[PDB]
Amino acid sequence: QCVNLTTRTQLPPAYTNSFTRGVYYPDKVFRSSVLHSTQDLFLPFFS
Amino acid sequence: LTESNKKFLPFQQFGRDIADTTDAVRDPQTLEILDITPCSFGGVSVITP
Amino acid sequence: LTESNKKFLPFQQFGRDIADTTDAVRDPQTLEILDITPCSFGGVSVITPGTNTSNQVAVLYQDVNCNVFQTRAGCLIGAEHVNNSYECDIPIGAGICASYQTSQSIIAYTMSL
Amino acid sequence: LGKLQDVVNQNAQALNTLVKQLSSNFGAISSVLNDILSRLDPPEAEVQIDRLITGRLQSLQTYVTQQLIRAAEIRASANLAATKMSECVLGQSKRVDFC
Amino acid sequence: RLITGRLQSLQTYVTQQLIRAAEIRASANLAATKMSECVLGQSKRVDFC
Amino acid sequence: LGKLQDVVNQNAQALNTLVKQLSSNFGAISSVLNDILSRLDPPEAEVQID
Amino acid sequence: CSNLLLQYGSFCTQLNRALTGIAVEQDKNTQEVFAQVKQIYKTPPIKDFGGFNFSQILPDPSKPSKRSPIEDLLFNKVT
Amino acid sequence: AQKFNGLTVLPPLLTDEMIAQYTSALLAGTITSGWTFGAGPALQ
Ligand SMILES: *[C@@H]1O[C@H](CO)[C@@H](O[C@@H]2O[C@H](CO)[C@@H](O)[C@H](O)[C@H]2NC(C)=O)[C@H](O)[C@H]1NC(C)=O
Ligand SMILES: *[C@@H]1O[C@H](CO)[C@@H](O)[C@H](O)[C@H]1NC(C)=O
Ligand SMILES: *[C@@H]1O[C@H](CO)[C@@H](O)[C@H](O)[C@H]1NC(C)=O
Ligand SMILES: *[C@@H]1O[C@H](CO)[C@@H](O)[C@H](O)[C@H]1NC(C)=O
């Protein structure tokens, strides 16, 4: 079960800037001392 | 399948090299890192007097 | 569709060139001869001062016609043209190079022989 | 050193390109020739293997031509170096602005 | 087949241009040697300048 | 004389290699085009001829 | 692949012969460049050449390689 | 022309004026110094 809330004064959402964030492993392989480029969904920098 | 000296991060099963060739695969049941090398090949050269 | 200065005989609709490309067609509405020119294209180029010297770069166009300086080797942006001449190091073409000189910014100048 | 580095870098990148050419299907449905043989019927499998061999044979000829041109350039440079050795090193050369 | 034929024509043009560039390099080396010897001094090589 | 013999042998071997390459099928069902023309119709045998 | 390779084994022979010729040509290049003399001349033990210092181009016995320091630097500079 | 089909030409690094200047400088050196300027400083 759930209940409803009441109207109140809230704050508008703000916008911030990312700084070298949103990088993960695009695969499950081991790569040492190489520069490998892949096409995959990531987070833009300075967005 | 030789015995390697390089450790793998505990989420990887494969492994490649600079030339993009699968030459290092982790054995799944005891977690050893083993390298892959082609057996041998070459040519039969002969010297004639 | 530019305005031509050559007229056609009153029985033709098309017009070709030496390279056998349709580059001239008569407009049927008012019997006006209009040229055909292919739309602009080319390749961008990057002028780099080098590693551990600067960070900013300049963008060079090969044959596209347009801070911004119109060179004889296309369009150069990001490099300020200066009238004096030194010995150049990074070739561009048509007798003008680019270099990083005094802060300090990338400049373009005619070569000194 | 510039002259001694290009002759190695070009060969290394040509070998890398030759390795990378095996990763392309050349318009077929697979890159490795084992998958099509182990997955498709023998009569139809002969038209993808033919595509693969044509693609790799086309790849193997441009490298040969580039190596032949590079070998000709190396021969010219070696002849120039041998003449320079035999003149400037093995005696005194009267040719101005040659040594 | 259009891509394959165009690639063949482009490769033939590239090989022809490379051969022409090698010939141009030989001619330019000969011209540079001639400028270094016959122009930048007097050359003792008979029937060369 | 090594050089003259070598260049003559290279030219002769290249010409003989071309002649024997004329005897190859290049993945087709025959080498000579006349056999394919006589045994198969030109509308169907166009791909082999090509 | 080998069963289809007999239609292009002649091209394979041509490319193999071209590679063999390139290899033997580069092998002959070193003979035409460095093998100018057939007598190996030993450096004299006396280093008094009127004041000319030749230790930078002559080999040194301090290292097993017996390569001149200029030559060793050249070897180390290029990869 | 031959540039409508993507076959762009590259302008030369040295324009004809610069090659003319180089040839004139070489001519002046070879008529005022001989071979001294080709193997060191120019000597009148
Ligand atoms: C010839 O040049 C070499 C330079 O490599 C000289 O060797 C140096 O000599 C000084 C003087 O004692 C030493 O401090 C250096 O450590 C030496 N360097 C090396 C690399 O050995 C050598 O002395 C010179 N010989 C003559 C006769 O002038
Ligand atoms: C695999 O399972 C066996 C038992 O089934 C176990 O003894 C062995 O340690 C396991 N290997 C691992 C966890 O790497
Ligand atoms: C480039 O375009 C401008 C405006 O479109 C024009 O004035 C100028 O003449 C053009 N440059 C050339 C070289 O035609
Ligand atoms: C360079 O100096 C000349 C001298 O008359 C002048 O005409 C020209 O405008 C100057 N160029 C710049 C960019 O200051």
From Swiss-Prot, chain B:
Assembly and interaction partners: Binds to host ACE2. RBD also interacts with the N-linked glycan on 'Asn-90' of ACE2. Cleavage of S generates a polybasic C-terminal sequence on S1 that binds to host Neuropilin-1 (NRP1) and Neuropilin-2 (NRP2) receptors. Interacts with host integrin alpha-5/beta-1 (ITGA5:ITGB1) and with ACE2 in complex with integrin alpha-5/beta-1 (ITGA5:ITGB1). May interact via cytoplasmic c-terminus with M protein. May interact (via N-terminus) with host bilirubin and biliverdin, thereby preventing antibody binding to the SARS-CoV-2 spike NTD via an allosteric mechanism.
Encoding gene per record: S
Protein function: Attaches the virion to the cell membrane by interacting with host receptor, initiating the infection. The major receptor is host ACE2. When S2/S2' has been cleaved, binding to the receptor triggers direct fusion at the cell membrane. When S2/S2' has not been cleaved, binding to the receptor results in internalization of the virus by endocytosis using host TFRC and GRM2 and leading to fusion of the virion membrane with the host endosomal membrane. Alternatively, may use NRP1/NRP2 and integrin as entry receptors.
Residues of the full protein shown: 552 to 600 of 1273
Protein's name in the database: Spike protein S1
The species this protein was found in: Severe acute respiratory syndrome coronavirus 2
From Swiss-Prot, chain D:
Disulfide bonds: 88-99
Domain of life: Viruses
Entry coiled-coil feature ranges: 5-49
Effect of residue 83 to I: In strain: Gamma/P.1
Annotated consequence of substituting residue 38 to A: In strain: Alpha/B.1.1.7
Mutagenesis / variant outcome for changing residue 37 to F: In strain: Omicron/BA.1
Chain's role: Subunit of the fusion protein that is processed upon entry into the host cell. Mediates fusion of the virion and cellular membranes by functioning as a class I viral fusion protein. Contains a viral fusion peptide that is unmasked after S2 cleavage. This cleavage can occur at the cell membrane by host TMPRSS2 or during endocytosis by host CSTL. In either case, this triggers an extensive and irreversible conformational change that leads to fusion of the viral envelope with the cellular cytoplasmic membrane, releasing viral genomic RNA into the host cell cytoplasm.
Protein's name in the database: Spike protein S2'
High-level lineage: Viruses, Riboviria, Orthornavirae, Pisuviricota, Pisoniviricetes
Gene this chain is encoded by: S
Part of the full-length chain shown: 945 to 1043 of 1273
Curated annotation (Swiss-Prot), chain G:
UniProt-annotated site: Cleavage, residues: 67-68
Organism: Severe acute respiratory syndrome coronavirus 2 (2019-nCoV)
Protein name: Spike protein S2
Glycosylation site residues: 53
Function: Precursor of the fusion protein processed in the biosynthesis of the S protein and the formation of virus particle. Mediates fusion of the virion and cellular membranes by functioning as a class I viral fusion protein. Contains two viral fusion peptides that are unmasked after cleavage. The S2/S2' cleavage occurs during virus entry at the cell membrane by host TMPRSS2 or during endocytosis by host CSTL.
Curated annotation (Swiss-Prot), chain H:
Effect upon mutating residue 37 to L: In strain: Eta/B.1.525
Effect of residue 8 to N: In strain: Lambda/C.37
Entry function: Subunit of the fusion protein that is processed upon entry into the host cell. Mediates fusion of the virion and cellular membranes by functioning as a class I viral fusion protein. Contains a viral fusion peptide that is unmasked after S2 cleavage. This cleavage can occur at the cell membrane by host TMPRSS2 or during endocytosis by host CSTL. In either case, this triggers an extensive and irreversible conformational change that leads to fusion of the viral envelope with the cellular cytoplasmic membrane, releasing viral genomic RNA into the host cell cytoplasm.
Identification of the protein by name: Spike protein S2'
Organism from which the protein derives: Severe acute respiratory syndrome coronavirus 2
Gene behind the chain: S
